[PDB]
C-alpha cells in the first residue's frame, strides 16, 4: 500500500486494521458462490459459525444437496464439530413473510447425531439507541467461516432469488418453490396441490412429535436439545421436497422471473480470524444478553400456552401417541429447564493467534455497531471470561460507522476514476425542487392516501373514520362493512377488497411521529463525497469521473407508499433536489466557466439568473463529464408473449482506481451508513502486486489485476457477453474493445449511446415501464389534429394520464394495465387481454436511466423516514 | 375593514393578510399550485375557476417586470424542450432504422417503424409556442398557431395568468372580452357591483355565471393559526367538496402519547345567520414534564345543495416552522374571534 496515497482507515473505535498475506477468491455469480460453498463444508473438519440477514436451508448449493443436507453430512464425518448459527431476529413475529423455519431447522440438525449437542442456535436481537423507533432496525452482517481458516463476506446470502446464472433469463419453470423470485408481479402460480410441504404442517408435526418470552422458551428447549435418534424425517432427508409461501402459489409459467446480479468473495488468512473474533463477541454478548431473567407473568404465560398445545395434542386421537424425552407422553412435569448459555471459551473454539504474512491481498474489516451492542458484548466477554488478543487502535465502547467512513475516505483519495455498483441512493439532497407543500397531493400517492374521497354517501353510513383511528376490530361496525358488501354493483364488489386491502395499509400509522419533532432530510454523506471530489476535479481542471449502477425501482410492487417514497427520495437524491448531485456539479462547471470576467463575491450571485429558457445559468452545463447513472433491463417471449423484467441490482461493490474493490452489506441509505441503527460486515481489499494498465489510452498506469479481471467481468456479464448461446439478448460486441479503459471519454460515450439506444427500442415497444414521456396521454378525448403537443412526464405509474399536471381539480386515471395488477396477465373472459410485438435493435442489458420519471410530482408517504 | 373573497363580503376583526403565489416561484407559473403564506405555513390549491371556457387564475405577491419576463421565458422553455426531446427520438430511431435495414433482416416491422416515424413527424410542427399582442398594456399573451390562452399580465406589481382549456376559434376575442372587464382591486376595498372577488382584483360580469374560489387567511396578530376560505357557486360542474386538500392526515396526525395528550374538538359556530358544526381535534401537553406546544385543527362547511358552498378550515403551525417565533395559542383564545368573522359573511 505505498504505490498510492491513499491509505485504510485509521481512528479509534475500528474493530480491526488491514492484515495481509490474505488468499481472496471474488465471485460475480451466485452459482458460483453456492458452489464452493458446498465445497468447503464437504472440507470442514472443525467448526463452522454461520451468521446472515436471511438464512434458509432450501437453497441448492451445487444443484442437487441443499444446505441442510451439506451441513448435516460434514457433523457425518466429524464426530468433534461444532456448528454456531447467528441470524438476524426480528423482534416482532415477522416483518414479512420471508422464512421461519430457520429455528426448527437446527433443531432438526441435530436429531439423530452419536455424541452431545455439537451444534448451537441463537438469535441475534438488535440493540440501538432508544429501540423505540429501533424495533425495526436489524442486523445486515454476512458471513461464513469454516474451521478458523476459510470466510466469506459479501451481500449474497443463503436465501431464495440469489443463485443467478451469467444468462440472466427470465424462465421460472426451472426452479422449484421459493426459488422463483418475482416480488413486483401478483404470483399467481401453484405447487402444494399434493407435491410440496406446507410450512405449517412441518412445524405442528414437530409439536406433535415433542408431545414475549415466548421465543426465549422456544430457544431454552432449543438449547435442551435431544441430538440423540427421535424420527427419521422424510421431507428433508430421503424425499427432499420444496416448501412454499404461507399462500403456497409460485410464479406462472408465462410470468418471468427477476434476475438477481450481487457480487461476493473468499477470504484464507488471518483475517479469518478477525471474522471468528467478531462472531465469537457477538456470540457471547447475546448469550449474557439471555443470562437476564424473563418475566414471571411471561413465563406463566407460556407455560399456559404449552400446557393448552399438549392438551390439544392429546386430544388429538391420532397424535397422542408416545413421547419418550422431557414430555413422555403427559407423564412428566412441566418445561421450565432452568437457563445454561453455551459460550465459546473452549480453546478449541477459540481462533489461535496468526502470525502476521507479506504479500498476497491485503483485507480489512469493516463493521458498523451502536453503543449498546458494544456494552453487550463487553458484557458478554466478561461473563464467558473470553478476551482474545487485540491489535493497537481497536476499541470496545462507543459507535462503529466503519462502512460510512472508510467510502468516505476512499473517495478523499481517488486519484482518476470510481465505479460504483450499489442497491440504494438516498444521501442529502437540500430541499426539494420543482415539488412544493401548496402542490396537490400526486395522483395515484392521493388515491391511495385519502379514504374518503371515493364514495363519500358510502364513507357516511360506514362512519369507519374513528374505528380506525382509534384501531379496534370491535370498534370496526360489523353491521356496516356488511351493508357495504351486501350492496349492489360489481364495482362495490371489487370496493370491498380494495377497502380491505386500504385498512391492512393503514391500520398502524401512529408508529413514532413526535419523537422529538418531524424532520425531512437524509443524513449520510455518500453523494456529497462524490460531488466534493467531482468538485476538487473541476477546480484542478484534470480528468475524473464516477459511475453508479443502480435498479430501476426498489423491490416491489410499485403500488406501495414506502416504495414510492422512495423512489421519491432517490429521484430527489439523483437529480430531482435543489443542491443535488447534478445540481452540485452544475453549479462547480457554471463557476468555473464563469471565472473570467467575474467579482469573487458576484459570481456567487451571478451564476442564479436565468436565461431566455427561463433556467438558471449552471443549468445549462453538462454534467456527463464527471456521471453515468445506468440500471439493467432484459426481455425474453415466455409461452408466447413478450415479457419485459428489470435486473436487480442487489450488489454492494465498489472500486477505487483498480487498487481497491470494497465489497460488504451497507446500502446507501441512512439506515445502514449512519452506524447507529443497523449492523454489517463489510470488507476493504487492497492488492499486493502490481500490473500496467492503458486507462485512457495515452498513459499507462499501476494496477492490480484481480480488481481489473473482476470489473472487467462485471462489464462483460453486463452488456450481455458471457453469456451462453441461444438468449434473447445479444452480444454488446463493440464494447469489448472500451471495457478495459475507463478514464478514456470514449469509453463512457460509446456505453452512454448504447444505453440510449436499448432505452429507445423498449420505449417503441413496452409503455408500462419506466420513461420519462407518457404515451397514454394520446389515449384522451383531446384531438391531435387540433395542436395538441404538450408532452407530460410520466408519473410513478407510466400508464396514469394527467388532465392538468400543476392542479389537482382536474384529476386522471391508468389508461393501461399496470404489470402489478392481475387483468395485465390474466386473460379474463369479459375483457380481450393486450399483446406487444417484439422488440428489435436491443443489445445488452444496460439502458439509460430515467431522470424525468415522476416530474413535479408528490410522492410521499407522510411515515417515518427512518422506517 | 371588510373584505370580500368570491362573491360573499366579511367583516374583519383586526389587521389581515391574504395568500398570493410566491415571488420566488412567480416565473414557474404554468405548473401552478396555489398561493402561498410562506414556504411552510401554507395551505394545499389556493386557486380560483370560472365558467367561462374552464378558466383559471392566480395572483402573485409583489414582483417585478424582471420575474415577470421570467415567467415567458420558462413558458417558451418548456416548449424549446419538449422540441428537443422528439427531435433526438427521430434522430434514434433513425439509426435503429439504419442498423435493422442490413441484408434482408427482420422484416413486416419496417411499415411498422415507419408509419411510427410518420406520426412522430406529423406532430411536430404543433409545439411551437406564439406570442400575440391583442393591443392590451403590458400583456404577455401566448397561444397555439391561431387559438391563443395562457393569459399574462402585471398591475400594480402584480401578476394575473389566466388560463382555458378549451378555448375555440374566438380565443382572442373571449379573452379580450374577459380583461377588459377584469379590473384591479385593493385590500379593504368592496365593490359595489356583481362580480367575482379575489386579492386584489374583480371581474364584474352578470353574476349568474359558475364560480369556485379558494383562499387562505392569517391574523397578523397570532400567524401560528390560520384560516382558509372555501367558497363556490351551487352546483357547479366541479363538485368540489368541503375538505379539498386535507389527504385524511391533517384528520389523524402522529405523535407520542409520552409527552402530549389529544383530545376531539366539537364546538359551536354559525356562519352568516345559520349554525354550522366544527368538527376536529385538538392537542394538549400532558404535565408530566415540560411541554409547551400546541396544535389544532376543525372544519365548518354549511351550505351548498341551493346557496353557495362555505367551508371554513382551521389550521395551526408549529413554533419554529419558519419567521414565526410565538407559541401556538391554545383554541379558546382565538375561536371567539373567528366567531365573531363567521358571523359576518352574507353573499353580496
Known amino acids: 500500500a505505498i504505490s498510492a496515497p491513499g491509505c485504510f482507515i485509521k481512528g479509534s473505535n475500528l474493530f480491526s486494521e488491514k492484515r495481509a498475506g490474505n488468499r481472496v477468491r471474488f465471485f460475480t455469480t451466485g452459482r458460483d458462490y453456492f458452489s464452493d460453498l458446498a465445497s468447503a463444508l464437504d472440507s470442514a473438519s472443525s467448526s463452522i459459525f454461520i451468521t446472515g440477514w436471511q438464512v434458509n436451508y432450501d437453497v441448492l448449493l451445487d444443484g442437487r444437496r441443499s444446505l441442510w443436507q451439506c451441513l448435516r453430512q460434514a457433523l457425518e464425518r466429524s464426530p468433534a464439530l461444532k456448528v454456531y448459527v447467528m441470524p438476524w431476529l426480528s423482534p416482532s413475529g415477522s416483518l414479512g413473510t420471508y422464512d421461519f423455519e430457520t429455528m426448527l431447522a437446527v433443531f432438526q440438525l441435530n436429531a439423530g447425531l452419536e455424541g452431545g449437542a455439537r451444534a448451537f442456535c441463537t438469535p441475534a436481537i438488535q440493540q440501538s439507541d432508544m429501540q423505540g423507533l429501533g424495533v425495526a432496525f436489524s442486523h445486515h452482517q454476512k458471513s461464513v467461516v469454516i474451521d478458523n481458516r476459510i470466510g466469506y463476506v459479501g451481500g449474497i446470502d443463503l436465501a431464495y432469488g440469489r443463485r443467478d446464472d451469467n444468462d440472466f433469463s427470465l424462465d421460472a419453470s426451472g426452479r422449484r418453490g421459493n426459488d422463483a423470485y418475482n416480488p413486483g408481479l401478483p404470483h399467481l402460480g401453484w405447487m402444494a396441490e399434493d407435491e410440496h410441504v406446507s410450512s405449517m404442517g412441518l412445524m405442528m408435526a414437530t409439536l406433535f412429535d415433542l408431545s414475549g418470552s415466548l421465543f426465549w422458551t422456544l430457544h431454552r428447549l432449543m438449547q435442551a436439545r435431544a441430538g440423540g435418534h427421535q424420527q427419521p424425517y422424510r421431507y428433508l432427508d430421503e424425499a427432499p421436497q420444496p416448501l412454499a409461501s404461507p399462500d403456497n402459489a409460485r410464479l406462472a409459467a408465462d410470468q418471468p422471473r427477476m434476475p438477481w446480479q450481487d457480487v461476493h468473495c473468499r477470504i484464507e488468512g488471518p483475517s479469518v480470524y478477525d471474522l471468528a473474533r467478531n462472531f465469537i463477541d457477538r456470540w457471547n454478548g447475546q448469550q449474557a444478553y439471555l443470562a437476564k431473567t424473563p418475566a414471571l407473568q411471561d413465563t406463566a404465560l407460556v407455560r399456559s400456552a404449552l400446557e393448552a398445545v399438549m392438551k390439544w395434542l392429546n386430544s388429538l386421537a391420532a397424535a397422542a401417541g408416545l413421547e419418550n424425552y422431557l414430555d413422555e407422553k403427559r407423564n412428566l412435569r412441566l418445561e421450565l429447564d432452568p437457563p445454561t448459555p453455551c459460550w465459546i471459551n473452549a480453546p478449541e473454539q477459540l481462533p489461535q493467534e496468526p502470525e502476521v504474512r507479506r504479500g498476497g491481498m491485503t483485507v480489512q474489516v469493516l463493521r458498523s455497531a451502536a453503543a449498546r451492542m458494544l456494552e453487550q458484548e463487553q458484557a458478554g466477554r466478561l461473563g464467558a471470561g473470553v478476551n482474545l488478543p487485540l491489535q493497537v487502535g481497536v476499541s470496545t465502547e462507543g459507535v462503529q460507522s466503519n462502512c460510512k467512513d472508510a467510502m468516505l475516505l476512499a473517495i478523499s483519495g481517488a486519484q482518476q476514476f470510481i465505479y460504483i455498483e450499489n442497491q440504494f441512493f438516498q444521501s442529502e439532497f437540500g430541499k426539494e425542487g420543482e415539488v412544493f407543500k401548496d402542490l396537490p397531493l400526486s395522483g395515484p400517492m392521493a388515491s391511495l392516501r385519502d379514504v374518503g374521497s371515493l364514495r363519500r354517501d358510502f364513507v357516511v353510513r360506514i362512519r369507519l373514520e374513528e374505528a380506525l383511528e382509534q384501531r379496534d376490530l370491535w370498534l370496526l361496525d360489523w353491521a356496516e362493512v356488511e351493508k357495504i358488501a351486501q350492496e349492489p354493483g360489481t364495482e362495490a364488489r371489487q370496493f370491498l377488497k380494495s377497502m380491505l386491502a386500504m385498512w391492512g395499509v393503514n391500520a398502524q400509522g401512529w408508529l413514532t411521529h413526535k419523537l422529538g419533532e418531524a424532520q425531512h432530510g437524509l443524513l449520510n454523506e455518500i453523494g456529497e463525497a462524490l460531488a466534493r471530489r467531482i468538485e476538487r476535479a473541476i477546480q484542478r481542471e484534470h480528468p475524473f469521473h464516477v459511475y453508479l449502477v443502480l435498479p430501476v425501482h426498489p423491490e416491489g410492487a410499485l403500488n406501495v407508499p414506502n416504495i414510492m417514497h422512495q423512489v421519491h427520495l432517490t429521484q430527489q437524491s439523483l437529480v430531482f433536489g435543489e443542491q443535488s448531485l447534478v445540481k452540485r456539479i452544475q453549479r462547480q462547471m457554471a463557476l468555473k466557466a464563469l471565472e473570467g470576467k467575474s467579482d469573487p463575491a458576484q459570481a456567487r450571485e451571478i451564476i442564479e439568473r436565468k436565461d431566455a429558457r427561463g433556467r438558471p445559468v449552471y443549468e445549462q452545463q453538462d454534467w456527463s463529464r464527471y456521471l453515468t447513472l445506468l440500471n439493467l433491463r432484459t426481455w425474453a417471449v415466455l409461452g408466447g408473449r413478450v415479457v419485459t423484467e428489470q435486473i436487480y441490482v442487489h450488489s454492494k461493490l465498489l472500486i477505487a482506481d483498480d487498487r481497491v474493490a470494497i465489497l460488504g452489506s451497507a446500502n446507501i441509505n441512512d439506515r445502514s451508513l449512519q452506524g447507529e441503527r443497523d449492523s454489517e460486515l463489510a470488507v476493504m481489499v487492497r492488492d499486493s502486486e502490481p500490473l500496467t494498465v492503458r486507462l485512457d489510452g495515452k498513459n499507462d498506469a499501476i494496477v492490480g489485476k484481480a480488481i481489473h479481471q473482476l470489473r472487467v467481468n462485471l462489464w462483460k456479464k453486463h452488456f450481455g457477453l458471457s453469456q451462453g448461446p441461444g438468449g434473447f439478448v445479444k452480444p454488446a460486441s463493440e464494447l469489448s474493445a472500451y471495457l478495459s479503459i475507463p478514464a478514456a471519454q470514449e469509453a463512457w460515450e460509446a456505453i452512454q449511446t448504447l444505453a440510449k439506444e436499448n432505452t429507445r427500442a423498449y420505449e417503441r415497444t413496452f409503455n408500462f415501464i419506466p420513461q420519462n414521456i407518457s404515451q397514454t396521454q394520446l389515449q384522451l378525448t383531446p384531438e391531435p389534429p387540433k395542436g395538441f403537443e404538450d408532452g407530460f412526464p410520466a408519473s410513478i405509474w407510466p400508464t396514469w394520464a394527467y388532465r392538468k399536471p400543476g392542479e389537482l381539480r382536474a384529476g386522471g386515471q391508468l389508461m393501461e394495465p399496470m404489470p402489478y395488477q392481475e387483468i395485465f396477465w390474466r386473460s379474463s373472459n369479459l375483457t380481450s387481454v393486450k399483446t406487444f410485438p417484439p422488440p428489435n435493435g436491443v443489445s445488452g442489458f444496460i439502458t439509460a436511466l430515467p431522470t424525468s420519471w415522476t416530474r413535479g410530482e408528490r410522492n410521499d408517504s407522510g411515515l417515518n423516514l427512518s422506517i | ?348
Open chain 2, 1 to 348: 375593514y371588510q373584505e370580500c373573497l368570491g362573491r360573499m363580503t366579511f367583516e374583519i376583526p383586526e389587521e389581515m393578510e391574504w395568500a398570493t403565489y410566491d415571488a420566488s416561484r412567480v416565473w414557474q407559473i404554468s405548473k401552478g399550485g396555489g398561493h402561498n403564506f410562506t414556504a411552510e405555513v401554507t395551505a394545499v390549491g389556493d386557486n380560483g375557476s370560472y365558467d367561462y371556457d374552464s378558466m383559471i387564475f392566480y395572483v402573485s405577491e409583489k414582483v417585478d417586470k424582471n420575474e415577470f419576463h421570467n415567467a415567458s421565458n420558462y413558458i417558451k422553455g418548456t416548449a424549446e424542450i419538449y422540441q428537443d426531446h422528439l427531435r433526438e427520438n427521430i434522430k434514434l430511431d433513425k439509426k435503429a432504422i439504419s442498423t435493422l435495414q442490413k441484408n434482408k433482416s427482420e422484416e413486416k416491422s419496417i411499415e411498422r417503424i415507419k408509419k411510427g416515424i410518420a406520426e412522430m413527424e406529423a406532430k411536430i410542427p404543433l409545439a411551437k409556442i406564439y406570442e400575440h399582442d391583442l393591443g392590451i398594456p403590458d400583456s404577455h399573451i401566448l397561444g397555439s398557431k391561431n387559438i391563443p390562452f395562457h393569459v399574462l399580465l402585471w398591475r400594480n406589481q402584480r401578476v394575473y395568468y389566466f388560463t382555458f382549456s378549451k378555448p375555440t376559434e374566438n380565443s382572442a376575442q373571449r379573452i379580450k372580452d374577459l380583461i377588459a372587464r377584469f379590473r384591479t382591486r385593493e385590500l379593504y376595498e368592496v365593490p359595489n357591483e356583481p362580480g367575482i372577488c379575489f386579492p386584489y382584483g374583480f371581474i364584474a360580469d352578470d353574476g349568474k355565471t359558475a364560480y369556485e374560489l379558494k383562499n387562505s387567511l392569517r391574523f397578523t396578530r397570532t400567524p401560528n393559526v390560520i384560516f382558509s376560505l372555501l367558497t363556490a357557486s351551487a352546483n357547479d360542474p366541479w363538485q368540489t367538496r368541503p375538505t379539498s386538500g386535507l389527504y385524511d392526515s391533517d384528520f389523524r396526525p402522529g405523535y407520542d402519547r409520552q409527552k402530549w395528550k389529544k383530545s376531539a374538538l366539537l364546538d359551536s359556530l354559525h356562519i352568516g345567520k345559520r349554525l354550522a358544526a366544527f368538527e376536529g381535534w385538538r392537542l394538549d401537553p400532558r404535565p408530566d414534564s415540560g411541554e409547551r406546544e400546541r396544535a389544532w385543527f376543525g372544519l365548518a362547511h354549511t351550505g351548498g345543495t341551493l346557496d353557495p358552498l362555505v367551508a371554513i378550515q382551521v389550521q395551526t403551525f408549529q413554533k419554529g416552522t419558519d419567521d414565526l417565533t410565538d407559541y401556538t395559542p391554545p383554541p379558546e383564545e382565538v375561536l371567539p374571534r373567528l366567531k365573531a368573522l363567521s358571523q359576518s359573511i352574507e353573499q353580496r
